[PDB]
Amino acid sequence: RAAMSPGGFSTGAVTEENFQPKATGESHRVTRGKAPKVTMEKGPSNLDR
Amino acid sequence: MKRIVVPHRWSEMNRV
Amino acid sequence: ASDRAVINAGGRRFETLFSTLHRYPDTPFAQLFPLPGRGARQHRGREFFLDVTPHVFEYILGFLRTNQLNLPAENLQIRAEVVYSMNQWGLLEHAFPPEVIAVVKLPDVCVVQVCDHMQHDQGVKRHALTITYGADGFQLRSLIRRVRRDLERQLSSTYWQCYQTNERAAFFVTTKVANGTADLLTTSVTQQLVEHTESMGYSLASSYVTLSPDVVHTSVRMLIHNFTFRRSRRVSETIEAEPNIPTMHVGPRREPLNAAESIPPRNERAVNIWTVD
Amino acid sequence: ASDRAVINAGGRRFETLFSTLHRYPDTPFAQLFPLPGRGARQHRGREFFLDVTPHVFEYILGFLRTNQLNLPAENLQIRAEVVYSMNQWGLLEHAFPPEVIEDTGGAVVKLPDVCVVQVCDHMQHDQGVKRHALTITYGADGFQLRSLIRRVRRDLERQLSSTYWQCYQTNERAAFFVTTKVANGTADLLTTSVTQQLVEHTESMGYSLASSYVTLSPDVVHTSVRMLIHNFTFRRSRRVEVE
Amino acid sequence: ASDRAVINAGGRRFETLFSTLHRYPDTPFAQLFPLPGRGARQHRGREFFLDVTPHVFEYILGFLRTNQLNLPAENLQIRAEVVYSMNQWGLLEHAFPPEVIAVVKLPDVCVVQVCDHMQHDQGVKRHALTITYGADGFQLRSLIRRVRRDLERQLSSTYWQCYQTNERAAFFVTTKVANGTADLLTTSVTQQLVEHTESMGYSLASSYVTLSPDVVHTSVRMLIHNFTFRRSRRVEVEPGDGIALGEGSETIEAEPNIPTMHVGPRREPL
Amino acid sequence: VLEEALAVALDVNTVRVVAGVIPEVGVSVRRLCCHVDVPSHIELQPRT
Amino acid sequence: GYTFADFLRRLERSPDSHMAPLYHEHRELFVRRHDMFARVISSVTWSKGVALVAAAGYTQAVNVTIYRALLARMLLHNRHVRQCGAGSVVPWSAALRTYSEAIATHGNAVPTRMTLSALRLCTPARQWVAAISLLMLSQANDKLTLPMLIDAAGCCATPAAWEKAMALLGRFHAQSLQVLPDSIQSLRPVGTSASTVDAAAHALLPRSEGPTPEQKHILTVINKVVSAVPWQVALSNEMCRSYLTHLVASTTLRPTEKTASLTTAVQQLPWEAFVTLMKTVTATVQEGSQSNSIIREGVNLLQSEPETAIPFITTILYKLPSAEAAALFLSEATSAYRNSSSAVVAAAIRHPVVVGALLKRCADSNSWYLAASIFKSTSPTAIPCDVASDLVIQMRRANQAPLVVDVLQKYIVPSRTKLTEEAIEAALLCVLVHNRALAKASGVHWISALSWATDLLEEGVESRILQTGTTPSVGGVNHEDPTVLLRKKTLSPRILSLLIYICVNAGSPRGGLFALGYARTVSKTELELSEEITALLYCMMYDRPREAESIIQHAVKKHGEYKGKYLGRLLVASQEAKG
Amino acid sequence: ELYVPGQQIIPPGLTRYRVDVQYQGNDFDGWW
């Protein structure tokens, strides 16, 4: 969650090509499984190389 | 005395 | 007389006004030389004798008339005489005021950092130039209108957008065109970038370009292009109206052409009081 | 005796004829110097005062005497003062006239005093062979890309055949040069010769090379497109007219 | 007047004082040329003839009035003709004394290295900037103040820090700033860097870049910006000769931190 | 505990404190610095 | 959790520099809703409006309705600054910058109402080159209208270039022929006697007598252009003579605006031309229907009283060359009213516009001793408060205590007269000096001095935020009438220090703590030494002199000596009140 | 009153105060 978190409050210019639709399709009261996260990629050691 | 016109787009200049 | 002052410096005799030497009377340059007392003794003209280099004596008295002091860059001996004579006489402290920080002043140098974001998939490109200036005062609305006029003749606006995001930052994109067309856009942007800064009174001193490798799972690059300018210049038209954030034109127009402009009624119309030909 | 006029600019005295400053009557520089009017009041000579640099005024008065111009490239502060002083005095359009092109006749163009050239080389690799897609792109209009491709092709007939490379024109400011099935050693002959023909063609237009700075893709993994971005900076310092 | 000294040197007429030539009593230039003895025979002004160049004697007479000597580097003859006049008249020992066993000197060129540890990952751009110089004499306190004047108005002091580490090296921190605002950060630090160095008197000869990936973390990249500054002379006063004439007031620095390493009552040391 | 103590001592219904450090279970603190947003019409002495 | 009204309250309490984050915080209301942005702009100050416009110019695509609502809010602020009397007018430069931004964002898409609002905003600044440039810009786009010509002639009403405004009015009359004589004749309907003037204020059925609001705007432009014109051609032109004769014999509008137009109109005329014009109109309107200078106004009044009590005695009061002439016009004309059987007209001297005219004639002469005789004699009535603000200032320059606090507690407070910021700053200083005199002799209570800073306070801004339910809606019926939430009063720190010293010398330090909390709540105005002032007040409440000396010594050893000078002055002002 | 684009916006009617506290940690359950 720390890799995808924007630092502080962040806003940009608005354009109708980028909409950000709020119609998600599930309940808004639950927040389990909704955070942006990277897929963890662990590099190989020199034994694996 | 400044005449105000709209700048033409490329679809307006090269309209066929 | 109170009008003419004759100072013999190094054999050369120069003529000056009493208001020139006593422009800064609190300095030791003026209070050590009694100009009104020498005018009552010598009725024709005041006569004083100074021991300086005569070319440096033109530099200090020429500063009192033009209010600008220019020092020689090559000749370091004459350069050392101005910093010594005006310090001993007290004219140096009044020449360069130290200020402590509405008008806006342009800086001496100017750097422009351009951060591109490239995407390439088999012979096409996709650019996102983030133009960023170094300080306030640069009219980027005049910069973007230089970009929008020259790029509308080459390519349609359905492939690129350009708008202002800050006072010292601009933006420009390119939506998946070929390599011959994308390099046409990027070179035309960076030429209007420097030509806007040449019109502000600067000159391009140095520049460099930086290309970054791909991200580890996508074909995304980061092309960094940096410039550096310097202060070279020593300091009823036609309104072309455009919004800042542009709107896209996809498909047919939803509103007709006559619904854009506003017209007054015919009964409210008056005759023109200025001539029109 | 009476035809000479004294010009004092920046603490330096200049003396020159009457007809040299009135060589172009429609310019605003001649309008601010009333040479028959100042000779009527002062019968000896005209005395004028200017606040310009003495080194800058030698280039401006030197253009009026001798119909030539060479801007200094070693000093950008002197050169930018010469172009700016000849713009506010209206002397640049007679020094750098607009060009005439015949494609249909339409002849109005102003060449930039600072132009940039972006040379992008696309190195690809597919099924054991490699290729180059060199893209030359000028800054603005007015340049002659028809003559550059003539110089690129003619310098390449001796080096290679027409099978391994193609060079044609895509836009008025963009040039294309492809390269396929070449060796490692002869690939350096092509990229150096096109870079050789790029500079001296811009020298034939009346420009001067200011600086060059190149970047290259520093990735060690395989990339479908590797990019060699050569950037040129040209400054117009003269004018070249062929015959 | 009798105090004026008229000297004919090479055809050009020069006028000076009696005490300027008699500033050094021991030299043969002032010993073999008696100025008050010639003032008793010449009522209006004394007259002296010399076989020296007029372009040379402006550097000879200017040395006695300024207590310093500067030689032109582009002219090898006037460099040779002045120093030969210093040797035949005995003023080389007074101009250049022997070195006994500490002012700073600005070099003719300076290499400024700017090391950036930039971390960019989808909208967020984190920087770690280190500005270092190649020599001493540069006022890094003035360089930080130019950053503190601009970036305090552009962002809060929470997101960025800037302080001094060495006499010729400085540091700049940046923590999790977005796309546009971090571009305003690094451009303004680069703006005030060239503004500080060109105000010293230098001129940017060339600027070039060096990009590198990182070993530990993926999205971090090293950016080395090396700056080559050639020395010129600005039309205003430089801080080199300005600090000898107009000594600016040195402001008091911030209070440093005294770290604590002990826990307890901690009886007083002896 | 700190929230209800500040709500009793300032006579407000519910106040919110935000700490600089969120320590885990068992670790002592010596100077834990936090900030509270209180109504501006309270003019109590800081020792009171 | 939060409503739109609380968002508007947070916007109106935050400063102008905080317009950029909040717009970027609650941007879901502004990116797709132009009506919401127009409602935000109309319910907020013009400086916050142009700040929100400059913030949204870099993010959204602003419409012409946004700039239209901004110019309408600036015109409403101009109307409020005309009505109230405090604060500054909207600058012409900001209106020109807003019109330039609207004309650079939208070319040939703004209506003519944008140009009309720009000319109405440039009208009180008397900037006519801006009007000429706007007329040239509108003519180059082939949209040049007649109300734009009227507002440009109103803009060009100036003693420098009145001829251009007269030429604009002549071209307007040449283009449209019947608007000007009908708008002038609306001030004099056919069949008007004194009984009509009686029945306009006595009888029922308040019918509209003919002047439309567009004709009222035309007549206001005519009043401005006749105030700007000199008296020579104002008595030779048919239009100017007709307007001057129809204004003094209007009898169709309210006497307040008639008095205002009469004070503005006849200013450039001399005294002899004024009395001959009044004599000529009193001759013709009474022959159709039916020093020594203080005698010459008596014969002017006794022939001209069909319900003409209000405007004439103010117009002649303004036309007098001095303020002692106005005092003689108050005294000897009242004596002549007692002599010439005029008991009915003397009940109209207690009208507030007459005493406001007398106070303005005393204020422009800077005479407070003449104003005090009118202050202590007459009944307290609603002063238009532009003159009572500087009369307290002029009384402060005499540096005397009891008259200022006496007139404040006996003429200003029961009449509900609202002063400006500097007037209250002078009045609280005079109250403090009079209270120190009463303390050293042994009457302002501290609660009354707290209420005189909050209730008696006037700002140049207008409250326009409505409640959530009290808004004319498109769906459903309204339960309540549209109510406006009053803005909480902001206090300058000079008023804070004066209230602190007043509550200290009164003997109740709780009021100073309440005033400090109110100042921290309404505007975040924290004093530089307030952390010591709070503890000094707490030592005052619990009678701790040694701690009050120790905190002064600690503030001397921490801050400067001049910072502790204020604490020492507060201590020696507390010690005289405790003793 | 000026605004910088990264500052802490305090809502009106509220004032931020700094507290410095301490506890043992063994007796308490900890923070939130």
Side-chain angles (χ1 to χ4, degrees), chain C residues 8 11 49 51-53 71 74-77 79 81 84 87 107 109 111 113 115 117 206 208 210 212, chain E residues 15-17 20 59 65-66 68 70 74 120 183 186-187 191 195 207 209 221 233-235 238:
Chain C
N8 209 333
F49 183 76
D51 193 9
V52 280
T53 306
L71 303 178
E74 178 260 309
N75 204 4
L76 310 179
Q77 184 69 263
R79 165 67 186 264
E81 299 320 283
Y84 182 77
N87 179 38
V109 311
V111 291
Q113 177 179 349
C115 290
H117 286 71
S206 182
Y208 50 88
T210 325
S212 167
Chain E
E15 293 178 344
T16 172
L17 258 64
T20 57
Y59 299 151
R65 298 175 292 195
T66 338
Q68 59 95 46
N70 299 334
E74 83 289 336
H120 171 72
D183 267 309
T186 55
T187 317
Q191 176 78 25
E195 277 183 29
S207 58
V209 83
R221 282 155 185 169
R233 295 304 174 105
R234 201 155 271 268
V235 291
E238 282 188 357

Side-chain angles (χ1 to χ4, degrees), chain C residues 101-128:
Chain C
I101 57 180
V103 79
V104 43
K105 186 178 182 179
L106 291 178
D108 303 332
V109 311
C110 168
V111 291
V112 173
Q113 177 179 349
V114 181
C115 290
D116 200 293
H117 286 71
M118 294 203 49
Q119 285 191 11
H120 45 271
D121 306 87
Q122 198 58 257
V124 300
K125 283 171 162 186
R126 178 186 180 181
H127 299 270

Side-chain angles (χ1 to χ4, degrees), chain C residues 165-185:
Chain C
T165 63
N166 207 314
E167 203 271 347
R168 48 174 72 172
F171 195 47
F172 174 75
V173 282
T174 290
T175 75
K176 279 299 182 180
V177 309
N179 302 339
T181 325
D183 300 333
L184 219 162
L185 298 176

Side-chain angles (χ1 to χ4, degrees), chain E residues 142-186:
Chain E
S142 185
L143 174 59
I144 298 170
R145 282 168 191 175
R146 299 178 93 97
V147 182
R148 297 275 186 166
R149 283 308 177 182
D150 208 334
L151 290 192
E152 275 177 5
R153 325 168 192 170
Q154 212 72 25
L155 209 49
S156 58
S157 303
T158 299
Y159 283 95
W160 60 269
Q161 307 177 15
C162 183
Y163 55 92
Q164 190 174 352
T165 61
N166 208 78
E167 207 273 346
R168 63 176 73 177
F171 194 55
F172 175 76
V173 217
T174 275
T175 53
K176 294 283 294 178
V177 199
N179 273 343
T181 28
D183 267 309
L184 304 184
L185 288 176
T186 55

Side-chain angles (χ1 to χ4, degrees), chain G residues 221-238:
Chain G
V221 168
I222 289 169
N223 191 40
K224 292 173 176 181
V225 87
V226 86
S227 301
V229 80
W231 68 97
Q232 289 296 138
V233 89
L235 270 313
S236 73
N237 204 341
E238 184 69 31

Side-chain angles (χ1 to χ4, degrees), chain C residues 48-100:
Chain C
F48 282 142
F49 183 76
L50 279 182
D51 193 9
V52 280
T53 306
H55 195 197
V56 185
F57 193 72
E58 185 265 340
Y59 276 156
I60 167 172
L61 272 77
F63 164 71
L64 305 169
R65 321 171 196 177
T66 64
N67 209 18
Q68 284 187 4
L69 180 62
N70 286 22
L71 303 178
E74 178 260 309
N75 204 4
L76 310 179
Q77 184 69 263
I78 288 187
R79 165 67 186 264
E81 299 320 283
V82 190
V83 87
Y84 182 77
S85 56
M86 280 166 48
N87 179 38
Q88 191 182 11
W89 296 343
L91 208 131
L92 184 58
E93 291 85 46
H94 296 254
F96 307 100
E99 307 177 23
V100 181

